[PDB]
């Protein structure tokens, strides 16, 4: 970027900006009372 004693419109410059994009997206089990009761392991639920 040069210059001179006279000056004037000599060195014009610009700027930009960028963009970003994201997203948010996204399970069960069942059991019977007879299963828990008549089981040998009484800590099965845990």
């Amino acid at each position: 970027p040069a210059l001179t004693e006279n000056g004037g419109r000599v060195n014009r410059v610009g700027f930009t900006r960028i963009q970003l994009i994201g997203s948010i997206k996204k399970f069960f089990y069942e059991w019977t009372q007879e299963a828990m009761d008549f089981d040998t392991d009484e800590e099965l639920d845990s």
Binding site: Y29, E30, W31, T32, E34, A35, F38, D39, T40, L44
Partner: protein, 48 residues
């Protein structure tokens, strides 16, 4: 899930204890005694 009887395997897996064991057992009362009561006893000495 389900707990079908061991022959039809349970959903969770194998089952070990299928029975509850009642500790107390059943005995038979001794037959009441009749002829033994009526008796006389004579002592037979040894070396005789």
């Amino acid at each position: 899930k389900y707990n079908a009887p061991n022959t039809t395997p349970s959903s969770i897996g194998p089952q070990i204890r299928l029975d509850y064991y009642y500790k107390k057992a059943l005995v038979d009362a001794a037959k009441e005694m009749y002829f033994g009561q009526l008796a006389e006893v004579t002592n037979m000495p040894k070396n005789m």
